[PDB]
Amino acid sequence: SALGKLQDVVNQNAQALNTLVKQLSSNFGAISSVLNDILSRLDPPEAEVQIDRLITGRLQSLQTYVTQQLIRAAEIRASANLAAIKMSECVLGQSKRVD
Amino acid sequence: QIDRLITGRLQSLQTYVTQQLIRAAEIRASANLAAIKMSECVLGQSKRVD
Amino acid sequence: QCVNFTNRTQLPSAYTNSFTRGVYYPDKVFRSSVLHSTQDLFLPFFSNVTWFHAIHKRFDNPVLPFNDGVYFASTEKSNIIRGWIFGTTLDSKTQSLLIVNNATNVVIKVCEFQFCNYPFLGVYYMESEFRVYSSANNCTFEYVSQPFLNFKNLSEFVFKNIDGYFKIYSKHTPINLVRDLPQGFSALEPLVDLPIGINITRFQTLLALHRSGWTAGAAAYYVGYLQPRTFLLKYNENGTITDAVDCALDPLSE
Amino acid sequence: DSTECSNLLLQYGSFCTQLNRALTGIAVEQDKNTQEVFAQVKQIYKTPP
Amino acid sequence: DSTECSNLLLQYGSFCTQLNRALTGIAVEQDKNTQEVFAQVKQIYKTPPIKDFGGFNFSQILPDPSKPSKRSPIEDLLFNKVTNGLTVLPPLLTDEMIAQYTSALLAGTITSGWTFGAGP
Amino acid sequence: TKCTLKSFTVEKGIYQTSNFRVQPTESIVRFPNITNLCPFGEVFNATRFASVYAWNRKRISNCVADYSVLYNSASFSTFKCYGVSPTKLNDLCFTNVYADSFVIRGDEVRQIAPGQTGTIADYNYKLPDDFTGCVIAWNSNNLDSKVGGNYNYLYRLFRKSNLKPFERDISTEIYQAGSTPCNGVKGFNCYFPLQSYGFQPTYGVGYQPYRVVVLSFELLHAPATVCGPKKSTNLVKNKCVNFNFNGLTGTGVLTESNKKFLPFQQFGRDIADTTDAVRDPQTLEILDITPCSFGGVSVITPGTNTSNQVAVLYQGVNCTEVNVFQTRAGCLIGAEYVNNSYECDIPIGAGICASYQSIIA
Ligand SMILES: *[C@@H]1O[C@H](CO)[C@@H](O[C@@H]2O[C@H](CO)[C@@H](O)[C@H](O)[C@H]2NC(C)=O)[C@H](O)[C@H]1NC(C)=O
Ligand SMILES: *[C@@H]1O[C@H](CO)[C@@H](O[C@@H]2O[C@H](CO)[C@@H](O)[C@H](O)[C@H]2NC(C)=O)[C@H](O)[C@H]1NC(C)=O
Ligand SMILES: *[C@@H]1O[C@H](CO)[C@@H](O)[C@H](O)[C@H]1NC(C)=O
Ligand SMILES: *[C@@H]1O[C@H](CO)[C@@H](O)[C@H](O)[C@H]1NC(C)=O
Ligand SMILES: *[C@@H]1O[C@H](CO)[C@@H](O)[C@H](O)[C@H]1NC(C)=O
Ligand SMILES: *[C@@H]1O[C@H](CO)[C@@H](O)[C@H](O)[C@H]1NC(C)=O
Ligand SMILES: *[C@@H]1O[C@H](CO)[C@@H](O)[C@H](O)[C@H]1NC(C)=O
Ligand SMILES: *[C@@H]1O[C@H](CO)[C@@H](O)[C@H](O)[C@H]1NC(C)=O
Ligand SMILES: *[C@@H]1O[C@H](CO)[C@@H](O)[C@H](O)[C@H]1NC(C)=O
């Protein structure tokens, strides 16, 4: 568990990708989660409604994924800014700052 | 009708979680600053101005 | 022809532990080196499974409910157990399912059989005795296939009836344990899918007599009932289920 | 406590798991923040009488 | 690949452009972060062939010539101990170049102290 | 790039402008091998047929029924299908098939139809109005007629009431046309129900014997198992094709697989529940399904003030699937690799950078 911070970031990113891929299997209230099944089983007046339900569900999932990706990007950017400050002040000089 | 209630409540809950995450990031930044101040002002004497 | 068995010895049926048996493949999909969570009609781990004996004078053929599904385990030697009866009323009023495994082949018939109270097969010391039903009037489905089959052989079967589909799962295990179910894990492969499309609430075990009255060969079987629950299955590099977790058994497995 | 509502809610997938996981991450993050700020000494020092 | 789905998706506007732009910004931000952390020297410093540092041993942190990856034993241990329209873009700086940057920083701080961070 | 950036001047850099998709080329529809044919030889090619009254009924279940062999035969005079068309019989699937076989006259073939009237429909063989199936009839003057007269085929001439659909009457009880009881003797007003057709070869075409097989197709709430055979388009590997294996459809590149399936398993899924392995139903071999290549299309250019030369990067796409150079980032077209190392001007990725001096990478 020495390298838990990097493994934590890798696991969070992989878990977000796995959840985003898994969200395609959900129908979001439609008859099926497969577009081909809806297009082959229903007439276009009701297939348009079913495809619209799938589109809004998948778009909500993608927007949610992008939102947590942006939040994690901000957190990683803050950590990287801290790492650059530590590289400048601890490696390239001697720091009087305690701890 | 239940589907309309579900989508409205789910949108509300996702919105609440989104601002909770943003406030969590802000509080985490403030706590990191507080930890730096605890290390450098309390546990030592700091030459950093202000 | 029907024959009443009047030489039985009265004894209560036993109960024992299921351990980690009764797991079957939920679908026909290959999965390798993965952990898959599935919600299906499964047999709970460490459950109370009913134990019936055939020893001499015990001959256990009671009337048992089917419920959502039946796990049937058999610690068998010398081939006494021959088949099963499924139905609701077990007469000509409703339509019933017959599965038999005689000396040559396995026969599945869906007919309105007028069943005997004590249906049985017989071996003379060759098979020359068959007393299961007195009539068969309306037959819709027939399926003839290959033979499916100290206690030396363990046969596990799972019978389910969902959406007009009769799923039979089977597994054959070489064992050398004397009296009870061995403790271990063995995933049941799917054996057959039958389009019977009939209502089933009651089932019967079919046995075979030994004649040289009658004598019952040494055999033992176990009946368990399926419940809807979630399992976490582990697939190895060769696609074989090697371990399982009951999601609702205890907080550790949860 | 509506069973029908939960059955319809299951069609949307793992949104609830995502929200619970995010809230759990925030909840453990608060404790981590308190550890980082206040638990910087492993010796409990005391003043003289 | 559904044409009807894309035709219905065009009714919602430029949501897809927003999501792609945000992901592109994150992707360039990661490379900017790696540049900010590791690319702080414009000179690639190297250690002398004779490792006479007055008794100080830096073999566990200097790059190993025997390894093809040109990593330190500590860095090699660190790399060993970490294990539908989606694409993964490679990082701009590869692992060997990042290791080369760390090697340059190590050589600068060993042979020159803090002088290389403030000038020549 | 100008279209994407909404500007007529493009600053120096790399801009992701489009996407590339290897479009599918063929459709591969592999279903299982044609085995277990339905016993149509024992119905049509029978050595003797039954009479119209005691008409033979054979129930056909759990096999593969190839109806195109019957439709494309030239030996049948009537192939009139009611309630279904012959072209989709070889596609559709039914729970059971009822094959009724009998012999009637030439002029009596028209009465084997929904909504008709006559002696055969009223007293011998009645078809329902809601009938789905086919009536196949052919001349059998060669087999069923002899020079002395063939009296083996009979028909019920009378009965008190009309038959129900798919009813068989084999009773030999004396018809009572009058008030007086017959008492088993064919006297006055009391006649015998079954009358023979004295089939002779020299008869007219409206009186010659015709063998009729009526196939009745019903759909019941049980799963339909008597399915017509499907075909197998020649498998194409190493190309982006649309695959349909046993009802599982998709688009992908089908390559050889080293995964050893268990005999009961047909498809393969990864962690993310996507189908990445499959078993061919015709030949028991395992095929990997690699998704068809998709990638970002990025344009690498200097300023339009400097030059109009551009390079195209296909991200994560091999160069054989699109001044062509292969990078770890993808395939770069329009730039030439130089062994020299310079400062990074336009970032490509994986240590690769581009610059203008022509465009070099
Ligand atoms: C074997 O025993 C069973 C039960 O004792 C007999 O079934 C009974 O048959 C009688 C017919 O007179 C019915 O009135 C009872 O209701 C039946 N009981 C049950 C539980 O089914 C069966 O007939 C016996 N077999 C023979 C051949 O006599
Ligand atoms: C610096 O430290 C390294 C490692 O601690 C020393 O390398 C060891 O040398 C001895 C004697 O030659 C070997 O038996 C060990 O197996 C070496 N260890 C490793 C990890 O290679 C090295 O000798 C030390 N001194 C100098 C001047 O480099
Ligand atoms: C099984 O059930 C019987 C009665 O039904 C009971 O006596 C026995 O204790 C049970 N066994 C277990 C392990 O619960
Ligand atoms: C087994 O049953 C089948 C079907 O009834 C029959 O054809 C066969 O002869 C039987 N075999 C023996 C040995 O009785
Ligand atoms: C079942 O059989 C009885 C008599 O054998 C018959 O009257 C009835 O119509 C039959 N039902 C079906 C559905 O075949
Ligand atoms: C099946 O039979 C049981 C009892 O005979 C009855 O309660 C149930 O409703 C039946 N189900 C169907 C689908 O007929
Ligand atoms: C998997 O199969 C290989 C042979 O292909 C065998 O060597 C290996 O031991 C098997 N692994 C397990 C866990 O059965
Ligand atoms: C029946 O006989 C005809 C004529 O001899 C022949 O062409 C046909 O192949 C036979 N079989 C079937 C199934 O029609
Ligand atoms: C399928 O039929 C072909 C001949 O068309 C044969 O070569 C092949 O072995 C068969 N496969 C199976 C699994 O029966």
Residue numbers in the entry:
A (entry chain A): 943 to 1041
B (entry chain B): 992 to 1041
C (entry chain A): 14 to 69, 77 to 145, 153 to 176, 185 to 247, 257 to 298
D (entry chain B): 745 to 793
E (entry chain A): 745 to 827, 856 to 892
F (entry chain C): 299 to 620, 641 to 675, 691 to 694
Copy text from the publication.
SARS-CoV-2 utilizes a trimeric spike glycoprotein for attachment to the host cell receptor angiotensin-converting enzyme 2 (ACE2) and for the subsequent cell entry step which involves the fusion of host cell and viral membranes. Given its crucial role in the viral replicative cycle, the spike protein represents an important therapeutic target and is a critical antigen in host immune responses. All emerging variants contain defining mutations within their spike proteins, with multiple mutations clustering within the receptor-binding domain (RBD) impacting both ACE2 binding and antibody neutralization escape, while mutations within the highly antigenic loops in the N-terminal domain (NTD) across these variants reduce antibody neutralization. Given the rapidly changing mutational and antigenic landscape of the SARS-CoV-2 spike protein, a structural understanding of spike protein mutational effects and the discovery of broadly neutralizing epitopes is of importance.
To identify structural mutational impacts on ACE2 binding we next determined the cryo-EM structures of variant spike-ACE2 complexes. The resulting maps were obtained at average resolutions of ~2.6–3 Å. All mutant spikes exhibited slightly higher affinities for immobilized dimeric Fc-ACE2 when compared to wild-type. We did not observe major differences in spike protein expression across the variants, and all mutant spikes tested demonstrated marginally enhanced ACE-2 binding potencies relative to wild-type. These complementary assays demonstrate that the totality of mutations within each variant S protein enable slightly enhanced ACE2 binding, suggesting a contributing factor for the increased infectivity observed for these SARS-CoV-2 variants. Superposition of local RBD-ACE2 complex models revealed no significant structural changes. These structural findings confirm that mutations outside of the RBD do not modulate the positioning of ACE2-contacting residues at the receptor interface via allosteric mechanisms. Our structures of VoC S proteins in complex with ACE2 demonstrate minimal structural changes in the RBD, reflecting its functional constraints in cell attachment, only permitting mutations that preserve the ACE2 binding interface.
